[PDB]
């Protein structure tokens, strides 16, 4: 069928696990859901000590880049 759609779906599950019910918003695009989740998790995880300041900054910067690439298709 398509492994490209499978690649996207597989990635989505890394932001919204089969530990299923902390659900994304159904009407959001896949990338918008994932970026929103990435940001919420990075702040909580940085607060909790699970990621370091360098990891937090790089995650937030990548999200803003991704958000730039959404707004232009």
């Amino acid at each position: 069928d398509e492994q490209m759609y499978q690649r996207c779906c597989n990635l989505f599950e890394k932001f919204f696990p089969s530990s299923s019910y902390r659900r994304p918003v159904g009407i959001s695009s896949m990338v918008e859901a994932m970026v929103s989740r990435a940001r919420i998790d990075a702040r909580i995880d940085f607060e909790s000590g699970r990621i370091k300041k360098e990891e937090f900054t790089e995650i937030m910067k990548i999200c803003s880049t991704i958000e730039e690439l959404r707004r232009q298709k």
Binding site: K14, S29, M30, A42, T65
Partner: protein, 38 residues
């Protein structure tokens, strides 16, 4: 770690037109739908 892996992968998928299209255009709701017939 995982937070880095997954954001880097998303960034990489947004760097190629076909995957960028899938990810920007497809709603979360439609995912089970497309997935059912994949």
């Amino acid at each position: 770690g995982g937070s880095m892996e997954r954001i880097k992968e998303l960034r990489n998928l947004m760097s190629q037109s076909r995957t960028r299209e899938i990810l920007t255009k497809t709603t979360v709701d439609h995912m089970a739908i497309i997935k059912k017939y994949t």
